[PDB]
Amino acid sequence: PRDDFKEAVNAFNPNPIEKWTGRFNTENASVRRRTLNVPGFKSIPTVYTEATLPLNKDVTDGRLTVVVNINTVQPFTRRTPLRVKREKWYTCSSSCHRKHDEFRNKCISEGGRYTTESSKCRLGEKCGYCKQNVYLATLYLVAGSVGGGMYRESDKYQSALYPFYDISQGYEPRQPSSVNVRLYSEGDPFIAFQQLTEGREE
Secondary structure (H helix, E strand, O other): OHHHHHHHHHHOOOOHHHHOOEEEOOEEOEEEEEEEOOOOOOOEEEEEEEEEEEOOOOEEOOEEEEEEEEOOEOOEEEEEEOEEEEEEEEEOOOOOHHHHHHHHHHHHHOOOEEEEOOOOOOOOOEEEEEEEEEEEEEEEEEEEEEOOOEEEEOOOOOOOOOOOOOOOOEEEOOOOOEEEEEEEEOOOHHHHHHHHHOOOOO
């Protein structure tokens, strides 16, 4: 559990990632060394290279194409949809008629669509869900280590965020004019945190 994370943090070597300069599309990349604050641990080092991509000709028919040309990393291209769906379920908890229809209203009100799954919203019941439009703000990429000081985009980790799919990215209710791109190493504690935990707590 926490020991597996301990195993990852200690093994992590951020030194090679300090060389990950280059470009995401047009923009120059900048290596960022930051700290991961988790209870019971000294400040954990997380390192990635990043850039801010403006929405321009890199957008075509709702998809953002990013070309990754980072040093020591075998270059690759990634395509990501600007828009995806966010499905959230309402459960009638002890905390549900009054709290149910507002959840319903928020969904509609915020541009989403609500779907009923039960004729009546009883305690402990999945009464329905909201399908919400969310838009790409932050894009996480992962490069797996190859021998000889070289890297290559990770097949298993299509993202740095659990569950690590292509679309497992930072999506917002309101689409920004620019997208922030980030490239991680597989051994980064942020990914290890995400994996072992999924929900940012141990």
